[PDB]
């Protein structure tokens, strides 16, 4: 019983090839153009190496896509080309195959980054406000472009703290939003799946990303990643219930005529909502603020319809300070 | 029905506390002795960071053990203490709990390393022979000490090609060998599990590591990692079959009175053995040598009994050159 409440048409109006990505025809650049230097990461569907551009001598990231449907690559690629240039959007610099093994790679722009787990603590109330305001420009942009990043969580956002620069990455789960489409709920990453994916409400929208931002931000101010720690999809919803309280999970469910598999019903059970302040500990107190709370609270709603839009959130009292600093 | 054919009764002769690791009592050193700097790896059971010793100012590796039975920690701890000093054995430098959470972290010696995927290509026929000979001193040592590393594969061997130095790491799967004990076959890593784990022959021995050394090597000289690429344990055996051929898988099975679950029988099927030369391609030809083949061949046998000992392999014509360079 959903449709997007912002940018619902971003693909309707656009030429079909804009979102008809299987129709894409990859225009391969020059492998020889790059050399690899060190492995740096290795995701479910990819392997990441830091490489280099022999021509211009610039550092770069080589993502070598592991075995997956060609159509699931033309997606990444298209989405990426569609976003390129977007504020805080990771930048695809060239895509390369390989004369022999026929093996596509995505060669991105390099970001020097510090794993959140070591970086975040380091941050100051301000620092956070800033990076989320930055992270926000990325989501609002891309949503505006008809796209859903569908897998927001620290590890997919690079921060060059030395340059207060930020990039949103892994558009391997991003997908085009089309009003009323029934999408797949096996997306995002456990911890950061929104209720809709956990109760099977398939015609979801950009809203999903808001909830991820929700968890991501919630955990940063409270210093408790993952905020909602499910051991399993069902558990996740549960762990979410014990915080937002079941009396809302229900109202939600009826609104969208959704039905909990019994059992999931069971496991969840009856739970009252836990108000945000019961997470303000001594160690985290400097980040928690009446605003951080309003803003978090307006991200974390069972109902994706009632979450803030990216745009909307970029105006929340939390960001006033930061938003000042750009104007100057 | 198996027993080790080398080093079987060593843990028999040694004082019970030598292998009776649950009996260990961790003597924690001082955390504040170290500071964390960059994450650098994240395994199933651990998270790896490069840190530093503030007293001596030496780089070090901090392995932070994720949630697991205390006894499965006293194991590695003990195993590591037992090996410490062993040739090419990663060296535990200090172990640590944490003030509250109460999570243990192992602080190892540092190795500057280059992911095999990036490094190996780079090696020369001799480079390989050397590194394997080095990798062998590790395995022969540790076997001789009653231990099975049960996880041999590239990612667990650190190479500082700059100093031709080598360390075998992660002993989270290594276990003490006791004659006739029925162990667990959910070990090693798919690609490198030997037949015995794939047909449930639980009383296995050091021999297991030999097969992993087998795959690891095979893949290095042929340039085809993983050599045997199973998508699943069943599939793994299958993929093995299609190379060593089923006429041997059977002689093996009967010898140890082992019975394939039907189905696995099915999936495997009838297959002839593919002779090692059928993997000598043009690029890889410089590393493939009558010896490299004999050696490989004597590592990869269905019958663990018939595999080379570590020691025995450290004398194989492949290593003659290296072995020379040694006592020189």
């Amino acid at each position: 019983m959903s449709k997007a409440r912002v940018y619902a048409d971003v693909n309707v109006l656009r030429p079909k090839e804009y979102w008809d990505y299987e129709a894409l025809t990859v225009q391969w650049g020059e492998q020889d153009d790059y050399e690899v230097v060190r492995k740096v990461g290795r995701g479910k569907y990819s392997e990441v190496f830091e490489g280099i551009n022999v021509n211009n001598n610039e550092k770069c990231i080589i993502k070598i896509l592991k075995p997956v449907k060609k159509k699931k690559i033309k997606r990444e690629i298209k989405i990426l080309q569609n976003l390129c240039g977007g504020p805080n959007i990771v930048k695809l610099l060239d895509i390369v195959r390989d004369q022999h093994s026929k093996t596509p790679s995505l060669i991105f722009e390099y970001v020097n980054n510090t794993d959140f787990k070591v970086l975040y603590p380091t941050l100051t109330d301000y620092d956070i406000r800033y990076y989320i305001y930055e992270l926000l420009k990325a989501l609002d942009y891309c949503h505006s472009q008809g796209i859903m990043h569908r897998d927001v969580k620290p590890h997919n956002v690079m921060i060059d703290h030395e340059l207060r620069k930020l990039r949103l990455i892994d558009w391997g789960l991003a997908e085009f939003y089309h009003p009323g489409k029934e999408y797949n709920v096996r997306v995002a990453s456990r911890y950061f799946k929104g209720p809709e994916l956990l109760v099977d409400l398939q015609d979801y929208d950009y809203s999903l990303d808001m909830w991820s931002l929700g968890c991501m931000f919630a955990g940063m101010i409270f210093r408790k990643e993952p905020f909602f720690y499910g051991h399993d999809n069902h558990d996740q919803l549960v762990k979410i219930a014990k915080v937002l309280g079941t009396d809302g999970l229900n109202v939600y469910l009826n609104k969208y005529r959704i039905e909990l598999d019994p059992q999931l019903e069971a496991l969840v059970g009856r739970h009252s909502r836990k108000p945000w302040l019961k997470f303000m500990n001594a160690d985290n107190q400097h980040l928690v603020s009446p605003e951080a709370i309003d803003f978090l609270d307006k991200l974390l709603r069972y109902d994706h319809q009632e979450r803030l839009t990216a745009l909307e959130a970029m105006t929340h009292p939390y960001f006033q300070q930061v938003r000042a600093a750009e104007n100057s | 029905m198996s027993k080790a054919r080398v080093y079987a009764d060593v843990n028999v002769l040694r004082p019970k506390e030598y292998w009776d690791y649950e009996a260990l009592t961790v003597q924690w050193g001082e955390q504040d002795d170290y500071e964390v700097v960059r994450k650098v790896g994240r395994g199933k059971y651990s998270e790896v960071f490069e840190g530093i010793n503030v007293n001596n100012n030496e780089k070090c590796i901090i392995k932070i053990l994720k949630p697991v039975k205390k006894k499965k920690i006293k194991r590695e701890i003990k195993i590591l203490q037992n090996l410490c000093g062993g040739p090419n054995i990663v060296k535990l430098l200090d172990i640590v709990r944490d003030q509250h959470s109460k999570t243990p972290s192992l602080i190892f010696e540092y190795v500057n390393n280059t992911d095999f995927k990036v490094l190996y290509p780079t090696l020369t026929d001799y480079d390989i022979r050397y590194y394997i000979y080095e990798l062998l001193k590790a395995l022969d040592y540790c076997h001789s000490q009653g231990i099975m590393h049960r996880d041999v594969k590239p990612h667990n061997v650190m190479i500082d090609h700059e100093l031709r130095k080598l360390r075998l790491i992660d002993w989270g799967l290594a276990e003490f060998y006791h004659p006739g004990k029925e162990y667990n076959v959910r070990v090693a890593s798919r690609y490198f599990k030997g037949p015995e784990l794939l047909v449930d022959l639980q009383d296995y021995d050091y021999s297991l590591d030999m097969w992993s050394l087998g795959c690891m090597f095979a893949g290095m000289i042929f340039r085809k990692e993983p050599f045997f690429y199973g998508h699943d344990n069943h599939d793994q055996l299958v993929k093995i079959a299609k190379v060593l051929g089923t006429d041997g898988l059977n002689v093996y099975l009967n010898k140890y009175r082992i019975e394939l679950d039907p189905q696995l029988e099915a999936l495997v099927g009838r297959h002839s053995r593919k002779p090692w030369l059928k993997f000598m391609n043009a690029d890889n030809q410089h590393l493939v040598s009558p010896e490299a083949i004999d050696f490989l061949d004597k590592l990869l046998r269905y019958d663990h009994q018939e595999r080379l000992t570590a020691l025995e392999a450290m004398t194989h014509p492949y290593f003659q050159q290296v072995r020379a360079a040694e006592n020189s």
Binding site: V36, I64, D98, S105 | P121, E162
Partner: peptide, 16 residues
Amino acid sequence: YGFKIHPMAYQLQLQA
């Protein structure tokens, strides 16, 4: 030849 990974050659550490 320039040893190569998947498809790109590999930069170098140095030695002079």
